[PDB]
Design a protein around this ligand. Structure first.
Ligand SMILES: [K+]
Ligand SMILES: [K+]
Ligand SMILES: [K+]
Ligand SMILES: [K+]
Ligand SMILES: [K+]
Ligand SMILES: [K+]
Ligand SMILES: [K+]
Ligand SMILES: [K+]
Ligand SMILES: [K+]
Ligand SMILES: [K+]
Ligand SMILES: [Mg+2]
Ligand SMILES: [Mg+2]
Ligand SMILES: [Mg+2]
Ligand SMILES: [Mg+2]
Ligand SMILES: [Mg+2]
Ligand SMILES: [Mg+2]
Ligand SMILES: [Mg+2]
Ligand SMILES: [Mg+2]
Ligand SMILES: [Mg+2]
Ligand SMILES: [Mg+2]
Ligand SMILES: [Mg+2]
Ligand SMILES: [Mg+2]
Ligand SMILES: [Mg+2]
Ligand SMILES: [Mg+2]
Ligand SMILES: [Mg+2]
Ligand SMILES: [Mg+2]
Ligand SMILES: [Mg+2]
Ligand SMILES: [Mg+2]
Ligand SMILES: [Mg+2]
Ligand SMILES: [Mg+2]
Ligand SMILES: [Mg+2]
Ligand SMILES: [Mg+2]
Ligand SMILES: [Mg+2]
Ligand SMILES: [Mg+2]
Ligand SMILES: [Mg+2]
Ligand SMILES: [Mg+2]
Ligand SMILES: [Mg+2]
Ligand SMILES: [Mg+2]
Ligand SMILES: [Mg+2]
Ligand SMILES: [Mg+2]
Ligand SMILES: [Mg+2]
Ligand SMILES: [Mg+2]
Ligand SMILES: [Mg+2]
Ligand SMILES: [Mg+2]
Ligand SMILES: [Mg+2]
Ligand SMILES: [Mg+2]
Ligand SMILES: [Mg+2]
Ligand SMILES: [Mg+2]
Ligand SMILES: [Mg+2]
Ligand SMILES: [Mg+2]
Ligand SMILES: [Mg+2]
Ligand SMILES: [Mg+2]
Ligand SMILES: [Mg+2]
Ligand SMILES: [Mg+2]
Ligand SMILES: [Mg+2]
Ligand SMILES: [Mg+2]
Ligand SMILES: [Mg+2]
Ligand SMILES: [Mg+2]
Ligand SMILES: [Mg+2]
Ligand SMILES: [Mg+2]
Ligand SMILES: [Mg+2]
Ligand SMILES: [Mg+2]
Ligand SMILES: [Mg+2]
Length: 51
RNA sequence: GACCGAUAGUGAACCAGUACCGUGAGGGAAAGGUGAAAAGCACCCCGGAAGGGGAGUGAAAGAGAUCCUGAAACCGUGUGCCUACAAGUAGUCAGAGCCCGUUAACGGGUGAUGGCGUGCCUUUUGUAGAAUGAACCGGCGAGUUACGAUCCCGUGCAAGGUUAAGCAGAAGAUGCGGAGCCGCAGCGAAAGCGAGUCUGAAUAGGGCGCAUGAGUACGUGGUCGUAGACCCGAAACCAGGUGAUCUACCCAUGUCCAGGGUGAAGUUCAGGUAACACUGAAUGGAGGCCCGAACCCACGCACGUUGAAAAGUGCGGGGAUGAGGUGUGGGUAGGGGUGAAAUGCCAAUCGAACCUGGAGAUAGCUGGUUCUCUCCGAAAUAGCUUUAGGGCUAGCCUCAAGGUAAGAGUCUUGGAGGUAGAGCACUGAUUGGACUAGGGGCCGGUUACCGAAUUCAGUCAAACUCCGAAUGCCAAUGACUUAUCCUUGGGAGUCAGACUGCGAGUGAUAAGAUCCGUAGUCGAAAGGGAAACAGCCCAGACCGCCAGCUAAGGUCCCAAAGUAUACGUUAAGUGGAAAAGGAUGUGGAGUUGCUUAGACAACUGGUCGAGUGACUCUGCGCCGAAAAUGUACCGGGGCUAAACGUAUCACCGAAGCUGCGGACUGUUCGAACAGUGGUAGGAGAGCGUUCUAAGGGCUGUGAAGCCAGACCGGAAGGACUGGUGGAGCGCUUAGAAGUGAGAAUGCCGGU
RNA sequence: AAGGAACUCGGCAAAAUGACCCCGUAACUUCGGGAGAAGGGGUGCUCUGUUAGGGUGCAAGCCCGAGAGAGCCGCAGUGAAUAGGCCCAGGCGACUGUUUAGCAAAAACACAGGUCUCUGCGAAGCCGUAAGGCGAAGUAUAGGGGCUGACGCCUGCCCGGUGCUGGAAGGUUAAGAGGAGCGCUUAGCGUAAGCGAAGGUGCGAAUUGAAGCCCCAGUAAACGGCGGCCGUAACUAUAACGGUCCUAAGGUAGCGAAAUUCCUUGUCGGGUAAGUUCCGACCCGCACGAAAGGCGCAACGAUCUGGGCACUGUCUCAACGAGAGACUCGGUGAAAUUAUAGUACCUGUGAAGAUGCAGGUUACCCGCGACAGGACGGAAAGACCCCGUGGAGCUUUACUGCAGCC
RNA sequence: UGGGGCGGUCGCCUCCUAAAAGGUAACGGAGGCGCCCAAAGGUUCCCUCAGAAUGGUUGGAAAUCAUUCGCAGAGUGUAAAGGCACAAGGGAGCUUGACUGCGAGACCUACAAGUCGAGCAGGGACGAAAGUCGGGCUUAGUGAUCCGGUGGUUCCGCAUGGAAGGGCCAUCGCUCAACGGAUAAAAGCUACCCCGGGGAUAACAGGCUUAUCUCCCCCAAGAGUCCACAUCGACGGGGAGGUUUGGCACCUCGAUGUCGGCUCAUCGCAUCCUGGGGCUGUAGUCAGUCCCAAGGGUUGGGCUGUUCGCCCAUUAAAGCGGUACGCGAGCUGGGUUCAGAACGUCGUGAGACAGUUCGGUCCCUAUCCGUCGCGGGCGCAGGAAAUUUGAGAGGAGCUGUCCUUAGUACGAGAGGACCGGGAUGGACGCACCGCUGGUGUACCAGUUGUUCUGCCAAGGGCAUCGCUGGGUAGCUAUGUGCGGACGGGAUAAGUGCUGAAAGCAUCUAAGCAUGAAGCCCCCCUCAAGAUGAGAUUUCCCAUUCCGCAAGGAAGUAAGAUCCCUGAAAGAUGAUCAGGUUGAUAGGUCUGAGGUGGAAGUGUGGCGACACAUGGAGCUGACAGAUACUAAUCGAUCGAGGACUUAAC
RNA sequence: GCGGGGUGGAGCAGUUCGGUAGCUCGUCGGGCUCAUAACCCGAAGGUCGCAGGUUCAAAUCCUGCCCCCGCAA
């Protein structure tokens, strides 16, 4: 009696860890989320050589 | 004093802040009554005494010291009826026999036997429930009060109504007191304007108002707000204190450890060396050393487990000169201390001690909430919700006041719509044939090699439609019938629903499953049937009757009524449990092959001598058919009808309906008609308890209380008589409430 | 009796061992131990005997006292009571010690030893608001804190992240200093519109202004971390070797199916007739690893684990006996529980598991000694699960704060 | 929220579910939206689309033309539905009505909101005019309040004038997307845990269902040398059971204790063994499959907590299930899920498991029914003492090996029977103590320590009965004897005989047999409360009172009890042997069995000790005898026999 | 069913935000050497897994389809 409930209670604890990790990560990003630094564009043009 | 009267009122009426409980702060009871007067039972008898039986005192001793009254539980004694073949929610209805004789009544007690019948409460869709609560009896124990708001009702005055504090006065009535409050005027955010005003450019429209008018003061009642706010109940939080006489650690000063063993360093001697080293003996007496009592500890097992003991005993076990045991006196205190660290320990309490206070913390949760009858009578739904077992608005109920006839049923007529069915005209899916562009595999020419598209026929669709109902829905006009309906306001409860039939989804076209639509019953519905069986069938209990007719369902016995009538079927106890499938079971229709030119069968083409084969539909049966305590799907007996089908007629059968009698409610005009189940809940009318006022009484020639009884009223309830009791108590009208108990693992007492 | 662990989760419990003397005693070792290892033998009484010898004493005489020989008795001589069972092997902890008073004594805590770090003395650290204290009447060979835990051999790589330490300029930043300016107000100017001094007043920018942070180095017995893919050797198979990607760096020694191995009762060897346990190896380490230390390890342990011997009522399989209860009599006399009970069985029905309902079956009335199938028995308003916009303890880069510190 | 969690969802639009008005749920089936357009809006005017065939330079299936056919097969910004070809689809001219104030009246609706709207006024666009225009073919494209920003303003301005500040109108700021929005501001652990509730809600067992599971079938492609159906049974189809995995959430949260084991069983049959049969690809021995059959039986160990499973060794066999996965007020407590601790792993962490490991309190005196035993009462038409019948109930029910038949039948051999006789075991049961043993606490003996009887000798107490060696009665198994034997009756499956219906055939319809360890008996035990109270033999005898009777009372008869001595009986009652003309118990005497040579004395020895007297002495329960002691005297209870009929 | 990958021969970027297809090694050809390696000089090798859309332009954005790898299975 209560076999699966016991094991499923354990499962629910693992879920709570995921939810907490998620929530904290989201909150941390909102507090401090550096944007990716500018990737300077590269001008490219070549005077193709003639014969 | 419309305050209490010994469980009340102070905790304390009494030698009570006592007894008792706690180390302490602190907590904290129980317990009143002789008589007018002790006149408190001289004397005698039984007894060791207690306790009795007389005799005396007294109005009374059945007033004799827990001494007014003396209920119930509970415990006994005697006996009028019944009881040892009986299956019991304990009664109720019927009923002999026996025994009595009353509030004199179509009486009382008991009860062989027959019928019927699973407590009360709470909580539930649903409880006899094996869900909850109560051992029993008694007492106590829960919507109250203050101040505001609003509505109804009553009264006074009325376009007005009314005073508050305060001052005089019986703690009163009343007089004075007009400040203030509400209303008569509204509109606008406001300036402001005013029967109008605001918006707007507007004499427009529209909103809110006016014309269509009643308020106010006080009282009663309903509800609401703020207060503990109907009563009981947390785990907790915070504040101030009390604890280290237990236990943790520390500090100071004491004290305890029977006996035995092992033999460290060092030292000495002897040997040894050039010297040392080295070797052997002896001495020596180290150690969180060894073995083992006291003492301390607590490893295993048994026992104990309403214990001898709220942690022990018995048999073994570990340490036992050490980081040892223990005494005395001290220290550290809870947002703290102490911890060789277990969240362990800090007075049998520790993830935050104990006591008191804030405090009646809060509890959308559980439990409880006390007299009676009558009128009406739900909901378990929608929306929103840090919402889902809560709440709010609507729906559904009730009361009152208005409108009033505006409601409803049916018929007739009109209309909106795309479901069932059907259909392929579109969109998808799809079968066969034809015709086929191409596509691939073969040498640009072909394969029956994939094949687009076209066409012919043929299927199919919740999210296909050229079509398209039945019902249901919205209206209109009459007619016939019925009595509802709407507006405003007061009060609610309900938001867990259940099953059954039908139409669907989810599921597996399972579920007493789940979610909607629709109708019913239950919930909140007793009675009859289905053996028992909320939801199925029949049918709605105001009450009495030893009257009648019926419904579902029945009629051989249990058990009321047909062993009814007529015609067939079944042989399986089918009826009284299930499929695919199998089968010369049997009944009834129909078709067809052959047949006295002689069949089928059997006999060596003939003998023989009247039937013989196949198939379709259909009624009732058969096999397929094995579960666990015990026949075990007919309720039982039992049944060959007492089963099944068809038809007919009788009778039985409810609390349905009818007849007779009574009560009440409503409607219309004392009559008639109609109605009278009920949970949550609304409304009305009453009974009873305590106290007050005013009248009128009762009571020592016996009050209240208590105990009986066969009386009275529709209920709550009220009398009368007798016994006990020994001094208070009813009745009528009105008023005010500590006003009604069977349940709260309620509190206290008794048993 | 016979058997002897066949019992059982497990030799739990009991049995067996036990004193003194003599002989004898292994692996291993930290050279002390292990060790009472283990395994054996002896034990009574009598006579040689106030013994050989020893203590006391002036001596007599008192005590102590081995060893033998020679005999006697019994089933048996520490004749009773009291007094280790032992051996082999492994895991963990070194050890003695300490711990959940009252379900855990242990591998947990402590420990000596190791290391890191703080502290120059009014030390750091700690208690307190402060004074005043502990530290300490101490002074870096001392004191506090963290981690590890005797001893032996060792303790590898990574400073990118986080912490700590040290820097130097610079960037960012508060109060406080500064008050450019702007608004309001109004003497006055004006036909008005509007402008507007001074004063007052409401805002106020530049500039200035520390630590911290940013930045740069170091530090791992600081908190921590310690990888993927591809190819390659003349049988094959594996790769000493090579390529590339990523990282701060990719796990070294040692150990390994483990207190760690899910698959798994891995495979192999040993032990048994039979071994999911055990021991020895192997290494595809789900998910070892070097001071939350790695690997060994004598001694120690009421530690955990497996195997032998002894021994037995643990068992095959139960029997008998003793005492105390039970039972009868005399005395005394509770408790939990309890809606009232004249309180059967079967099948069924029902809130789906009935003493109580239905249909049958069975049953004369009342007890006593016994057993526990039922009364969903008693006890404790379930601790599991879910719910409540309940509580408390704890954690942190949750939110908001406070002390402390700079 | 078909427990919670994860996943998914949360507001709005379209369709289907939705049952032809509207509305209508589920974590039902499909999709879209959080915009876009300055023209893709308004108006005025004009206008048809897709596709196919044919003709044509590049040109190709498909670009552009041209003709014919061609209801929409197109398009309509953006999903779907409803519309649209007097277009809402395409093109062109001018413009901004994608206006301001509004708004009769309606739809929808709990509210808050949302939707439609003629018409009026102001000032405009297009148009010759009528007239149309308050965005788009229609239906999504959005967010309350509070609080801030901005613009306007015949509003207010706290003595007054200003101002500060506010109001009104317009407008902006929320993926407040959990979209009717808790605060401006918020994550976890609890195994150290606690409270209030719920069977409204998880689970076990129960109930319903039966997808799955187990078992059984239908069809028959086939496999099987041929041959579907000896055996096996593809592709499909139909059931039963309620042991499995599930679905549901109906009972239980003011408690229905768990897996495994132990003790004790009980039931079903889907039969593991034994019994009886059909078919066989059954020669014999063996087997295969199916039918009947539930009477009895159905092992001991190693490993593991285990169930299970593997293994070892047996057995005739090592059956499958139900009983709350039977059985914890019957036991155990090893596994698992309390508090401690540790490893691996995860986490910053408290801690946790996707894994392990060592240690960890099992309470209750039985009221009722039930079950096993034992009594008392009454009844059974007189009162007693014995012996009995059997309605009915319980018990028992198993089986191996060997010898013989017979090396026969059978077979090429190998091997090797049926049936019928006979012996002897295993397990199990009943009884009993003569035998073998156990026990034997009032028996006998040996012996240690100490204390006592004054000492010696001889003994007593205590030390587990001090210990040790024996042992009577009784009680006992492991010991012994015996049992399940012979068979009858009726049947099951099966085998048939005669025999029609249906000139044949046929076990069947009438009729007649056979045939199982099973059923009813036989065998053992209880049994007349069998209220239906039975039957037989024997004994006692009609009393005395009252009362009119019915009936009542009092002494007794036969007989029994109280009381007493006891055991062959026993918890107590009861039962049985006895109670003085009695051997009932004790004692006494004589024995048995048991122990094993007493004490005293003498002799031998220095002594411990040995020997003789002497199979001695001692001896609980056992046997026989014997009144020596106790069973005294007494008391109590116990019939006089109802009525009716029939036959005598 | 739920996720991750397919870029010259190997290992890897670039993909979100469209703009010449790349880095390291390797392969091939020619030198150097007696010859091989190293070294030096040139070149080839992917139209970004496949097939269609969108766009002036797609490895990159969209639609389908096929492989590889993890789990569950
Ligand atoms: K009183
Ligand atoms: K009461
Ligand atoms: K104190
Ligand atoms: K209800
Ligand atoms: K009187
Ligand atoms: K007694
Ligand atoms: K009954
Ligand atoms: K009951
Ligand atoms: K970690
Ligand atoms: K014997
Ligand atoms: Mg009082
Ligand atoms: Mg008086
Ligand atoms: Mg319920
Ligand atoms: Mg309850
Ligand atoms: Mg109760
Ligand atoms: Mg010591
Ligand atoms: Mg010791
Ligand atoms: Mg002491
Ligand atoms: Mg305590
Ligand atoms: Mg308060
Ligand atoms: Mg249809
Ligand atoms: Mg339902
Ligand atoms: Mg009811
Ligand atoms: Mg009625
Ligand atoms: Mg009639
Ligand atoms: Mg009748
Ligand atoms: Mg009637
Ligand atoms: Mg009626
Ligand atoms: Mg009251
Ligand atoms: Mg064993
Ligand atoms: Mg065993
Ligand atoms: Mg032991
Ligand atoms: Mg230790
Ligand atoms: Mg120790
Ligand atoms: Mg403890
Ligand atoms: Mg302990
Ligand atoms: Mg450590
Ligand atoms: Mg390191
Ligand atoms: Mg580690
Ligand atoms: Mg480390
Ligand atoms: Mg370590
Ligand atoms: Mg008793
Ligand atoms: Mg049922
Ligand atoms: Mg039942
Ligand atoms: Mg509860
Ligand atoms: Mg779910
Ligand atoms: Mg509709
Ligand atoms: Mg723990
Ligand atoms: Mg802990
Ligand atoms: Mg609780
Ligand atoms: Mg339920
Ligand atoms: Mg067949
Ligand atoms: Mg339900
Ligand atoms: Mg209960
Ligand atoms: Mg209980
Ligand atoms: Mg069978
Ligand atoms: Mg069980
Ligand atoms: Mg039980
Ligand atoms: Mg256990
Ligand atoms: Mg009972
Ligand atoms: Mg004998
Ligand atoms: Mg002597
Ligand atoms: Mg003594």
């Amino acid at each position: 009696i209560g076999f699966k409930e016991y094991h499923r209670v354990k499962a629910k604890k693992l879920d709570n860890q995921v939810k907490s990790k998620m929530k904290r990560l989201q909150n941390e990003l909102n507090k401090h989320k550096l944007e990716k630094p500018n990737e300077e564009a590269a001008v490219r043009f070549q005077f193709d050589s003639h014969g």
